[PDB]
Amino acid sequence: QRDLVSFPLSPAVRVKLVSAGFQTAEELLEVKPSELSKEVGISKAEALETLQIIRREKKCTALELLEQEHTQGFIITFCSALDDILGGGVPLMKTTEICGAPGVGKTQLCMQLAVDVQIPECFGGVAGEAVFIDTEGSFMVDRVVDLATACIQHLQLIAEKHKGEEHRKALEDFTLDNILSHIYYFRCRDYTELLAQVYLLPDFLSEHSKVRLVIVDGIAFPFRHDLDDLSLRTRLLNGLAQQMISLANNHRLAVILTNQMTTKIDRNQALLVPALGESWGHAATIRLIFHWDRKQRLATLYKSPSQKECTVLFQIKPQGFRDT
Amino acid sequence: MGVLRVGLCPGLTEEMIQLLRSHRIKTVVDLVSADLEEVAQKCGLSYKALVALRRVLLAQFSAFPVNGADLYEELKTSTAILSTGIGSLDKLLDAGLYTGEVTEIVGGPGSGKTQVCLCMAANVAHGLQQNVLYVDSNGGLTASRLLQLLQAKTQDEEEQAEALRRIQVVHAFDIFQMLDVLQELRGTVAQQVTGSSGTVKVVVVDSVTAVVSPLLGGQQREGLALMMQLARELKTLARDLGMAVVVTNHITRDRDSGRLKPALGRSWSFVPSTRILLDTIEGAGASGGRRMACLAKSSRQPTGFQEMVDIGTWG
Amino acid sequence: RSSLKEIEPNLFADEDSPVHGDILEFHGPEGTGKTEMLYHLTARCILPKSEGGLEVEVLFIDTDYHFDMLRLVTILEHRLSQSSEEIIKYCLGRFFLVYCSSSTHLLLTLYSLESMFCSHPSLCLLILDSLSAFYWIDRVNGGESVNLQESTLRKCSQCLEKLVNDYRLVLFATTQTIIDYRPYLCKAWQQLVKHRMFFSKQDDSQSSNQFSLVSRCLKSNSLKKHFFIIGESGVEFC
Numbered sequence: 036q037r038d039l040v041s042f043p044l045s046p047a048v049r050v051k052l053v054s055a056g057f058q059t060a061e062e063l064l065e066v067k068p069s070e071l072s073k074e075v076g077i078s079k080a081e082a083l084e085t086l087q088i089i090r091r092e093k094k095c096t097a098l099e100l101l102e103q104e105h106t107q108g109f110i111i112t113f114c115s116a117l118d119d120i121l122g123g124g125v126p127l128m129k130t131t132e133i134c135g136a137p138g139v140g141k142t143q144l145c146m147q148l149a150v151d152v153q154i155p156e157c158f159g160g161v162a163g164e165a166v167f168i169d170t171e172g173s174f175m176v177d178r179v180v181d182l183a184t185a186c187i188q189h190l191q192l193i194a195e196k197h198k199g200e201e202h203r204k205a206l207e208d209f210t211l212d213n214i215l216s217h218i219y220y221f222r223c224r225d226y227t228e229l230l231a232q233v234y235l236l237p238d239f240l241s242e243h244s245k246v247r248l249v250i251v252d253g254i255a256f257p258f259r260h261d262l263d264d265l266s267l268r269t270r271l272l273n274g275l276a277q278q279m280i281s282l283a284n285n286h287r288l289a290v291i292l293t294n295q296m297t298t299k300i301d302r303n304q305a306l307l308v309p310a311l312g313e314s315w316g317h318a319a320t321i322r323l324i325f326h327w328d329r330k331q332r333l334a335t336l337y338k339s340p341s342q343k344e345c346t347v348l349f350q351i352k353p354q355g356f357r358d359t
Numbered sequence: 360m361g362v363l364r365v366g367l368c369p370g371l372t373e374e375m376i377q378l379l380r381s382h383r384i385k386t387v388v389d390l391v392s393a394d395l396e397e398v399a400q401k402c403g404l405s406y407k408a409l410v411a412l413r414r415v416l417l418a419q420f421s422a423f424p425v426n427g428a429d430l431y432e433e434l435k436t437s438t439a440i441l442s443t444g445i446g447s448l449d450k451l452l453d454a455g456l457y458t459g460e461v462t463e464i465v466g467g468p469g470s471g472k473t474q475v476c477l478c479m480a481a482n483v484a485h486g487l488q489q490n491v492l493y494v495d496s497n498g499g500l501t502a503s504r505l506l507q508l509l510q511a512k513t514q515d516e517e518e519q520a521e522a523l524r525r526i527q528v529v530h531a532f533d534i535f536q537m538l539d540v541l542q543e544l545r546g547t548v549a550q551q552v553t554g555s556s557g558t559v560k561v562v563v564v565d566s567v568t569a570v571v572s573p574l575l576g577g578q579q580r581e582g583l584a585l586m587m588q589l590a591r592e593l594k595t596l597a598r599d600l601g602m603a604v605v606v607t608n609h610i611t612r613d614r615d616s617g618r619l620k621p622a623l624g625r626s627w628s629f630v631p632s633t634r635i636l637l638d639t640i641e642g643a644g645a646s647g648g649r650r651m652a653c654l655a656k657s658s659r660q661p662t663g664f665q666e667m668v669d670i671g672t673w674g
Numbered sequence: 675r676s677s678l679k680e681i682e683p684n685l686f687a688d689e690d691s692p693v694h695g696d697i698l699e700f701h702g703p704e705g706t707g708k709t710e711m712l713y714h715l716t717a718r719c720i721l722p723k724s725e726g727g728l729e730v731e732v733l734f735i736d737t738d739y740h741f742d743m744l745r746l747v748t749i750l751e752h753r754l755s756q757s758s759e760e761i762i763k764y765c766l767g768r769f770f771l772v773y774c775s776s777s778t779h780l781l782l783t784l785y786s787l788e789s790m791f792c793s794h795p796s797l798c799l800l801i802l803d804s805l806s807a808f809y810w811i812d813r814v815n816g817g818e819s820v821n822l823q824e825s826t827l828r829k830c831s832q833c834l835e836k837l838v839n840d841y842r843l844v845l846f847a848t849t850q851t852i853i854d855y856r857p858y859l860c861k862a863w864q865q866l867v868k869h870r871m872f873f874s875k876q877d878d879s880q881s882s883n884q885f886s887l888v889s890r891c892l893k894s895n896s897l898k899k900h901f902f903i904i905g906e907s908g909v910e911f912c
């Protein structure tokens with residue numbers, strides 16, 4: 036017994052079918068479409084499309100999942116302590132969200148992750164691509180060039196120190212122009228454009244199967260202005276989160292999202308909390324917050340299903356995201 | 360009933376269905392609602408064959424009520440007791456968890472719902488040696504945490520390797536995918552009535568809110584129907600096939616007008632059988648694995664009892 | 675048969691007279707003592723005269739699949755003054771149960787169980803739990819037209835009223851929530867009820883046993899309030 040409500044049927048065909056008095060697909064499977072159309076007053080096209088959509092609609096256990104996640108590596112951050120606290124870097128097949136006060140280094144982290152995703156597997160990278168979707172216009176090519184130059188300098192240094200021929204073999208292809216051609220750029224100035232780009236993502240990822248990272252630098256800005264109806268915003272945010280997690284699990288990606296902080300006057304001493312309400316709080320697999328403390332930037336893990344929350348210091352150098 | 364098929368009931372022919380659908384009476388519901396005398400003499404059909412057909416049609420479509428005592432002795436052995444690692448709910452649940460009920464946990468961000476699900480699944484798979492099916496909808500599962508939890512109870516590689524392969528995981532991100540997965544599970548277990556091993560006894564849904572939350576909103580009505588259908592099929596699965604089903608959920612408005620309440624509105628409140636409201640402590644002793652567990656609805660024992668559960672030092 | 679004063683002084687004494695047939699329904703939110711109240715009513719009235727009950731038979735129809743054997747057995751054991759292990763099986767062997775999955779299934783079971791009725795006359799109470807569990811499904815399935823909705827529900831209503839008036843039975847039912855209530859079913863159900871009451875409970879922690887009830891008696895328009903206390907051994911009244 037399978038109720039017809041559990042199928043992606045059009046409301047009209049569903050309502051006329053249940054008005055006829057059918058409540059199981061097991062007997063719709065063998066009914067000839069001619070008398071089917073005659074009985075419920077429909078044509079052949081809707082009958083055949085209903086039949087195919089009904090008939091159209093794997094067995095992986097924990098061991099296979101463990102093996103698969105061990106096969107694919109982690110995205111390096113060039114911050115050793117941040118890699119240690121996160122289990123080895125940014126995990127794949129999961130949605131990661133970063134919050135923080137303005138001018139704290141979220142865009143620098145996004146740029147570094149875009150650069151770091153192209154490290155060859157021999158050195159310990161993932162060797163993939165990157166997709167950058169900008170909603171604020173804060174993507175400057177000069178900073179990316181500087182970060183890539185610093186990364187290639189460090190990579191050459193460590194390769195020379197290792198003194199291994201296989202390391203040299205994976206460097207001539209690792210040139211500035213090649214790595215900087217593997218970052219695909221978009222720009223959505225409105226939340227509708229961002230949603231449309233999100234709907235268009237799966238085909239783009241089907242075309243380019245080497246992509247292993249998707250960055251959406253700023254999701255609060257499109258949704259925090261000119262939107263009086265809160266329910267519509269909540270529905271859009273929930274749908275976007277579901278689509279992003281579906282994309283991450285289907286294409287083996289690492290979704291990176293950026294958020295904003297908002298002052299909350301609790302008790303009498305105001306403190307900063309992430310924006311977009313409380314329902315959005317558990318829409319991301321991992322949540323990270325960047326503090327300021329006293330002239331010292333701290334990266335504190337907030338929510339994760341793998342590691343306990345702690346605190347790690349960091350700072351930004353003219354070479355990019357670094358530790359110490 | 361749909362169109363006439365051979366084998367549905369004895370003594371069926373095309374003349375019968377032709378005359379009945381000419382008389383504006385085809386389905387079983389209006390045929391039995393209409394008087395048997397009316398169709399018998401008004402249409403002139405034979406009374407004996409008509410009454411025999413009606414009785415054999417009802418009998419093969421009905422559920423005959425049974426006595427209570429006998430089913431009680433059979434349920435004495437059909438049921439089972441599942442322990443997770445803490446007895447706070449165990450004492451307040453007639454000294455044992457119920458296999459065949461819909462229990463659920465409501466908790467906010469970082470509460471520990473999936474941690475409870477993970478530890479319970481590990482305990483069920485390893486200690487009691489049965490297959491378990493886990494359904495994830497937001498990527499909340501990591502196999503490293505399962506391995507770490509298993510290592511806290513065993514130190515042998517073979518046991519860890521064997522335990523993992525009996526935990527089946529499937530990804531469903533839309534309500535149609537979840538419905539298809541559950542229907543496939545129902546069909547497979549119906550086909551596996553002969554077998555005695557390999558049948559999953561515990562079914563866990565990581566998050567039922569996230570899947571159905573986009574479907575709500577507006578002034579329409581299809582989302583409520585979809586969630587009610589999902590609840591009905593979950594209840595039928597758990598009752599008929601004797602499985603323990605555990606789902607999670609979120610909380611709603613905490614303002615002055617509305618107390619801390621489970622999500623999905625009022626209609627979802629009637630669905631589950633047991634509610635556990637995880638919470639975090641404030642002030643001294645915060646952070647870490649210190650979480651306050653409470654029993655909101657049990658419908659079997661007095662409620663409103665608060666306890667302590669540690670996860671950081673547990674497993 | 676139709677007597678409601680022998681062992682019902684606490685709740686249902688001074689409102690009725692020995693008559694032919696009646697219909698009762700229950701309303702209120704979740705966790706209000708509904709199923710516990712039905713458990714009390716059925717356990718108090720499933721014993722023979724010598725053991726304190728009425729030596730009557732009750733049929734159970736379940737729709738929410740929330741019926742629990744262990745709670746009923748425990749409440750029976752903790753109520754029996756002569757509590758023993760060998761006679762509880764015989765005391766509970768006068769119980770009939772059936773499970774329902776859909777409104778069509780409910781109607782088909784209703785039109786099938788007449789052979790059961792004619793089998794035994796000892797049946798004296800009929801409980802239908804949560805007839806409100808099939809609202810949204812067919813409400814959206816039937817379509818925009820109101821007639822296409824609750825059609826099977828109207829047929830079920832007429833079948834139930836016929837089966838309760840003709841056979842001298844008593845009916846109990848439970849309804850969910852959507853001035854203290856809202857018109858939920860079709861109009862065919864409002865006339866059936868002989869006494870309607872609402873279930874309520876506040877959020878006081880130290881009085882988790884506290885419960886409240888308010889009833890409407892349309893045949894007399896009498897406003898009556900009742901108070902009861904939940905307990906492990908049963909439902910206490912004061």
Ligand SMILES: Nc1ncnc2c1ncn2[C@@H]1O[C@H](COP(=O)(O)OP(=O)(O)OP(=O)(O)O)[C@@H](O)[C@H]1O
Nearest residue numbers: 317339340341342343467468469470471473499671
């Ligand atoms: N809505 C939710 N969806 C998924 N997981 C949730 C949800 N709400 C809470 N959690 C879980 O609650 C847990 C509580 O955080 P906590 O840091 O204690 O866990 P942890 O990383 O497993 O800890 P530890 O490794 O020390 O045992 C999180 O790990 C998170 O997975």
Ligand SMILES: Nc1ncnc2c1ncn2[C@@H]1O[C@H](COP(=O)(O)OP(=O)(O)O)[C@@H](O)[C@H]1O
Nearest residue numbers: 135136137138139140141142143178351352353
């Ligand atoms: N070329 C550079 N050399 C050194 N520090 C830099 C350089 N470019 C940017 N920074 C520092 O990195 C920080 C970047 O913050 P930003 O990513 O803009 O935060 P947000 O994304 O929240 O606006 C700035 O505070 C700036 O001081």
Ligand SMILES: [Mg+2]
Nearest residue numbers: 138141142173
């Ligand atoms: Mg920025």
